[PDB]
Amino acid sequence: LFDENYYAKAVANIIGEVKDPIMYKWFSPDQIEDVDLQMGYQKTVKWDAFLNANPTTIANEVNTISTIGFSSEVVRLNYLKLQYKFRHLKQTSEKFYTSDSYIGDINNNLLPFAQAYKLASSEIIKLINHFVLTGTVSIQKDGKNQKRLLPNMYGLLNMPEQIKEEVASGDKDKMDKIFEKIEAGLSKLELGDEFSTPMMVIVDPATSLKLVKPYACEKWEDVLIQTIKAINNREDVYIETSNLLKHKILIYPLNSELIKFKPSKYMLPTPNEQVDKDSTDVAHSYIDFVLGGLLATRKTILQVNIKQS
Amino acid sequence: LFDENYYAKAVANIIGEVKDPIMYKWFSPDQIEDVDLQMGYQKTVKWDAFLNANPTTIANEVNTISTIGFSSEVVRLNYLKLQYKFRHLKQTSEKFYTSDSYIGDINNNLLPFAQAYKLASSEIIKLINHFVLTGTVSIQKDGKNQKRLLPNMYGLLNMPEQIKEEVASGDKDKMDKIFEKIEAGLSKLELGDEFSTPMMVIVDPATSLKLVKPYACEKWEDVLIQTIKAINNREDVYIETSNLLKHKILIYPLNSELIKFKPSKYMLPTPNEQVDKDSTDVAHSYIDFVLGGLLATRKTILQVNIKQS
Amino acid sequence: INNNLLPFAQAYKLASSEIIKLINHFVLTGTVSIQKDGKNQKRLLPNMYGLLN
Amino acid sequence: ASLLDSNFVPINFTEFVQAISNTYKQRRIQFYENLKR
Amino acid sequence: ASLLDSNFVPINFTEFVQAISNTYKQRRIQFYENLKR
Amino acid sequence: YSKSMIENKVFSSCFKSKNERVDAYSFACSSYTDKIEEYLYDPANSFPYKRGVKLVPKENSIYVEVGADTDMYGICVDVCEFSCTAYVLPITNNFEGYLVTRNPSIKIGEILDINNNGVIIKAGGGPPTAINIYALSDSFTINSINLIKVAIFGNRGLEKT
Amino acid sequence: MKNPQHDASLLSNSNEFRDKNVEFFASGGTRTSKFDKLENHPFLGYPYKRGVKRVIQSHYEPHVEAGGGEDLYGICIDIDEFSKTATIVPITNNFEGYLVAKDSTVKVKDKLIFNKDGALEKVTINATALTDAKQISNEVYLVKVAVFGNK
């Protein structure tokens, strides 16, 4: 294959230069599990058992014993296939544009296939990170013109049936009021028997600036960490800052028994076999990626919104 | 045996997927010693020595030497055998229910034997954990319909001849009153010459929230740890949170000379040889476990109860 | 003879022959019954038909 | 005699039960060894 | 089948895609191995 | 209605009080040597799951329909909706398990009676009870259907009031 | 007690195979079937070989005690003192064995009712006496009956 497909050879050579996605920091290693699918839906079945009565004492002869029941629950997940196109220089035309220690038309912004693919992959990976955190696909800082997505495709921020807390715009700058909502939201959390697990905090830059302020010789960040430690059995609490959020605070456990991520194993960018060729030196190529695969239980994610108006 | 008994084969292959009991975190490795008994009572004899008089100085000739005496104490522990029954598919019928990526009737809530046994074992282990911490057996959130148990079968919370402290319902939210009772209980604690040992603290989730409050830049938890470090020769002090407790605080040493756990080596769930069969595809199986074996010296556990009414 | 008890081999053969006759009746007629009157039919599932129904 | 051994072949049910008891004991020992408070 | 393996030689585009997915999976595993918090 | 009852966007959230499910295993304490029979039931008249049923010999087959204690044949413990088949424990056998009730406030130890709809009610309604039914737990509502743990052991010699 | 454990100094001569089974320690039933339903329950008092009623109320699970009448639930045929549990045959299951009689008035062909103390007394009907009442010791009378339900 590599003897015939130059582009496939080029991708295999330069696949290692693509940086790792930053979303991996938001999950524990056990929380991610790949699936084999491109587009469609997949059903997940979770099984449970419960005790129907007190256990039966075994003494002398007996035939009536207590029973243990079972239950099942099905959750549907949707997966969507998305594609992009980019232009690059034809392989046989590279010799006519190899300049002094750089290849490509500066005037015409044309690049070799290898460099074009690497840069394109980096941009797409950033977009995938935005979706997983937010649940929306948008290329604008405003977050508008969102591409319409299928249901059963949610991010950590818009996952339904979770504890949503809203801060009034009058208290947008009052850390005590913001922390009060957090405490109320934290109380409403329902971790059940899995409460002994590390927790993750995701904040926006504006919130982080407020956190490092003194607690009204302690900081709001320290108070928040202690409060979370009170419920997670005194375990690790990680705090992260992301520019993709705007006046939002995300708290959720890093436990595979509560939140599970099941992306398609083709989610990350993958080259397409079709290449557009013509009589000129410019060709076109396509990159494929798949979105979806987030699964979470009810009332296990705390989403706090600080309204600005 | 594995050539004839499919179920025995299935248990061995899946026995490793059952998670360890969480009760192991409440005991030191040396505090647990298995015994060989399914049902009945076992008498444990503890020997001691004492000095009758001052030692004898060896000089010149003498026949009258001071003597060293001995003493014994007998303790009886009761062990109980309990059983549970669960339904599952038959081995020869699994092939007709092997669906895509799962096996079993979603409509009929029937599972293969391997999955059924794993789920059943997990629930039983949860019940065993509850008994050791509490000493009571119940399947209701209200804690009613308790199964009556034999004497000499105590948990940490209900062990007699220990220090018991009560907080009035009017002071249920005053941490200063709660800590005052804790100090009085710690004063009444009698460890003798074995005071140099790590200590364990178990609290309910409601108390855990109160502990991280500022002390009235210091926390109530910090004050508590320092107070315990005063009496235990400044050894390690561990704090654990359990949802199985409600408005209770347990403090006890982790010294094998004071509190010892002697569970039966069959305490954890174990399959039974008997399997119910008929002409249909549904079969029944039984799981056995054993309860009891906690032994503690007098006045070595502090049990604080915060009355709500 | 006095109690109508047979060895398992003969008992199985006769029982199988009876069932096979019943299977033949269902395929041709689409209904399951043990009466010459054809009543007391066993209720079947939908999309289960014979050549006659 | 434990279920961890690939070379262990139980003969009857009593040996099978003893292997399970040993397996539970070994897991407990392993758990405390890897436990770091 | 991984692109990280030098001796690996894909036969067709389908195997090439499988190698890419395996490569991504191993990198994620390696990332979590090297991650420190 | 039905027993299984559906795709979910998210999963539903200790071991205690997990048996409060409509499709839970009916027998709180089972036993081999319990006789279980199969019958047909009306797929459009009344859903017999977890209800007291009576035998109605029809012109094509013997069906089971929800019935009162006076003419009760047994208790329907399970249903296979694919074949519309009801599984019945005859009244001659003991039962200890969860059944459908219409009173959301029933205490423990109270005497109970099965009404015309095959539903557990308080025995003080007035009809003379003919079966020994006792409430082993308080009635609980699943959101809506009311269930209660009961022990049924045979008929009562003389009808009570 | 079912088995009063007392140490002896001489062996008791036991060679005759007749009139050896009518004893207070012979638990179970004279004739028993594999398909007989048995339930063990916590008990109070000592309802051994007596009619038992189920008593329902720190809240505890229901237990059983000696009783009868409209509250009759079953028959206690065996007991375990260490576990404080009693094996019970439910009233919906027929039984054949020796039970406690109120006095010696009970004879063959006599219809019997379980009294408030779980003892069988002459006349709803529950059992039919098979033999005459025999005094095991003091006021303890045992009668062989065939329990069939309640009238």
Q: What is the number of helices (H) and of strands (E) in chain C?
A: 1, 0
Contact criterion met (CB < 8 Å) for A51 and F15: yes
State the Cα–Cα distance between residues A290 and A39, nearest whole angstrom: 8
Distance CA F66, CA F51 (A): 7
Length of chain B: 309
Termini Cα distance of chain C: 42
Tokens (6 digits) for G45: 């008092």
Q: What DSSP character marks residue B110? A: B
Q: Is F113 exposed, middle or buried (0-12, 13-18, 19+ CB in 10 A)?
A: buried
- Of A274, A284, A271, the closest CA to residue A121 belongs to A271
Instruction: Collapse the DSSP code of B159 into the 3-class scheme (helix H, G, I; strand E, B; otherwise coil) and give the result.
Output: coil
Q: Which contiguous run of DSSP H or E holds residue E19?
A: helix E13-34
Nearest to A242 by CA among A130, A155, A139: A130
**CA–CA distance, B193 with B300 (Å, rounded to integer):** 13
Our CA dihedral for E4, E10, E16, E21, rounded to 10 degrees, sits at: -40
In whole angstroms, what separates CA C14 from the centre of its chain? 12
Strands (E), chain A: 40-51, 56-57, 64-89, 98-99, 102-103, 163-167, 199-203, 237-241, 248-253, 259-261, 270-276, 282-291, 294-296, 302-306
The sign of the dihedral angle between the CA atoms of D10, D16, D18, D23 is positive
> Smallest Cα–Cα separation from F79: which of F90, F88, F71?
F88
Technique that determined the structure: cryo-EM
> How many whole angstroms separate alpha carbon B231 and alpha carbon B199?
10
Chain mean position to CA B80: 15
Question: What are the E-state strand segments in B30-133?
Answer: 40-51, 68-89
Distance CA B74, CA B46 (A): 7
CA distance A253 to A30: 13
The SS3 call for residue A252 is strand
Amino acid at the residue F106: I
Nearest chain F residue to B119, by CA: F15
Q: Which two tokens stand for residue C48?
A: 């289960």
Q: What are phi and psi of A262, to 5 degrees?
A: -130, 70
Residue B51 forms beta bridges with which residues?
A: B68
Q: Which of B11, B29, B268 sits opposite D24 (nearest CB)?
A: B268
Whole-number Cα distances in Å, A200 to A127, A130, E9, F91, G129: 22, 17, 41, 57, 76
Question: Looking at the partner chain, which of B8, B238, B265 has a beta carbon nearest the beta carbon of D13?
Answer: B8
Residue G140: strand pairing partners: G137
3-state secondary structure at position G11: coil
Q: How far is residue F68's CA from residue F117's CA, in Å, rounded to a whole number?
A: 7
Report yes or no: E18 at the A interface, CB cutoff 8 Å.
no
What is the C-alpha separation between G24 and G99, in angstroms, rounded? 9
Other CB atoms within 10 Å distance of the CB of residue G59: 12
Place of tokens 């430690």: A229
Q: CA nearest E33 in A: which residue?
A: A29
Q: After what residues is chain D interrupted, C–N > 2.5 A?
A: none
User: Distance between CA atoms of E25 and E2, rounded to whole angstroms?
Assistant: 10
Could you tell me if residue A95 is left (phi over 0), alpha (psi between -120 and 50 degrees) or otherwise beta?
alpha
Q: Is A220 helix (H, G, I), strand (E, B) or coil?
A: helix
Contact assessment for residue F74 and residue F89, using Cβ atoms and an 8 Å cutoff: yes
Instruction: Report how far residue A6's alpha carbon sits from residue A89's, in angstroms, rounded to the nearest whole number.
Output: 13
For residue F18 the two structure tokens come to 């997990």
Distances, alpha carbon G118 to alpha carbons A275, B58, F150, G45, G75, in Å: 93, 77, 24, 12, 9
What residue has token string 């949707």? A78
Please give the Cα distance from A19 to G48 (Å, whole number): 79
Using a CB–CB cutoff of 8 Å, tell me whether B144 touches chain G. Answer: yes
| Six token digits for residue B289 | 């476990």
Q: How far apart are CA G111 and CA G81, in angstroms?
A: 32
Question: What whole-number distance in Å separates Cα of residue D9 and Cα of residue B4?
Answer: 13
Give how far the C-alpha of residue A13 lies from the chain's centroid of Cα atoms, to the nearest Å.
28
* Closest to A292 in 3D by CA, of A139, A137, A83: A137
Q: How many CB atoms lie within 10 A of CB E13?
A: 14
> How far separated are the first and last CA of chain G, in Å rounded?
32
As to burial, measured by CB atoms within 10 angstroms (0-12 exposed, 13-18 middle, 19+ buried), residue B137 is buried
Interface test with A, best of E2, E3, E21 (most A CBs within 10 A): E21
Q: DSSP label at G84? A: T
CB contacts < 8 A, F to G, total 46
Contact A68 B81 (CB under 8 A): no
3-state helix, strand, coil split of chain B in percent (to 5) is: 30, 30, 40
Nearest CA in chain A to F27: A67
Contact (Cβ atoms closer than 8 angstroms) between residue B305 and residue B251: no
How far, in Å, CA of A7 to CA of A13, rounded?
Answer: 10
CB atoms within 10 A of CB F69: 25
Of A82, A87, A46, which is closest to residue A262 (Cα–Cα)?
A: A46
Instruction: Return d(Cα A191, Cα A196) in angstroms, integer.
Output: 9
Number of H helices, E strands in chain D: 1, 0
- Burial class of residue G88, CB neighbours in 10 A (0-12, 13-18, 19+): buried
Comparing CA positions, the residue from B222, B200, B235, B261 lying closest to residue B25 is B200
Q: Does F1 touch chain B (CB under 8 A)?
A: no
Chains that touch B (3 or more CB pairs under 8 A): A, D, F, G
- Helix/strand/coil (H, E, C) string of chain F? CCCCCCCECCECCCCCCCCCCCCCCCECEEECCCCCEEEEECCCCCCCCCEEEEEEECCCCEEEEECCCCCCCEEEEEEECCCCEEEEEECCCCEEEEEEECCCCCCCCCEEEECCCCCEEEHHHCCCCCEEEEECCCCEEECCEEEEEEEEEEECCCCCC
User: What does the alpha-carbon distance between residue G96 and residue G31 come to, in Å, rounded to a whole number?
Assistant: 6
What is d(CA F100, CA F46) in angstroms, rounded to the nearest whole number? 13
DSSP assignment letter at B215: P
Distance from CA of F138 to the nearest CA of G (A): 12
Kindly tell me the burial class for residue A105, based on how many C-beta atoms sit within 10 Å of its own C-beta (0-12, 13-18, 19 or more): middle
Neighbour count for residue F37 (Cβ, 10 Å): 13
What is the rounded end-to-end Cα distance, in angstroms, of chain A? 59
Centre a 10 Å sphere on the Cβ of residue F20 and count the other Cβ atoms it contains.
14
Most A CBs within 10 A among B106, B126, B149, B242, hence the mutation to make, goes to B106
Residue with structure tokens 């459908």?
F100
Phi, psi of C8 (to 5 degrees): -60, -35
Is there a contact between E31 and A24 (Cβ–Cβ < 8 Å)?
A: yes
Q: Which among B223, B216, B248, B247 has a CA at the least distance from the CA of B237?
A: B223
| Residues 6+ positions from B105 with CB-CB distance below 8 Å | B89, B97
- CA distances B245 to B46, B141, B201, B204, B261, Å, are 32, 11, 12, 5, 20
3-state helix, strand, coil in chain D (%, to 5): 60, 0, 40
CB nearest to G73's CB, from F108, F153, F160: F153
Q: If residue B289 lies in a helix (H) or strand (E), which one and from where to where?
A: strand B282-291
Contact flag A64-F9 (C-beta cutoff 8 Å) = no
- Which is nearest to G86 in space by CA: G37, G49, G118, G33? G49
Resolution (A): 10.6
Chain B residues at the A interface, defined by Cβ less than 8 Å, are 22, 39, 80-87, 102, 104, 106, 109-111, 115-116, 119-120, 122-124, 126-127, 137-139, 145, 147, 205, 208-209, 211-212, 217, 219, 239-241, 243, 286, 288-289
Task: Give me the helix-helix angle, A220-229 and A175-188, nearest 10°.
Answer: 10
CA dist A270 and A15 (Å) reads 10
Q: CA-nearest residue of chain B to G80?
A: B40
Closest of F140, B94, F31, B124 to residue A49, by C-alpha:
B124
Contacts of C37 in chain F (CB under 8 A): none
For residue A66, give the chain G residue with the closest CA. G39
The runs of H, that is alpha helices, within B154-296 are: 175-188, 205-211, 220-231
Read off the amino acid at residue B189: L
Say how many CA atoms lie within 13 Å of C27 toward its Cβ.
Answer: 6
DSSP H helical ranges for chain B: 6-14, 113-134, 175-188, 205-211, 220-231
Our answer on whether D and F touch (3+ beta-carbon pairs < 8 Å) is: no
Q: Residues near B122 by Cβ (< 8 Å), separated by ≥ 6? A: A49, B18, B19
| CA pair distance B215, A68, nearest whole angstrom | 47
Name every chain E residue with its beta carbon within 8 A of the beta carbon of A34: 21, 25
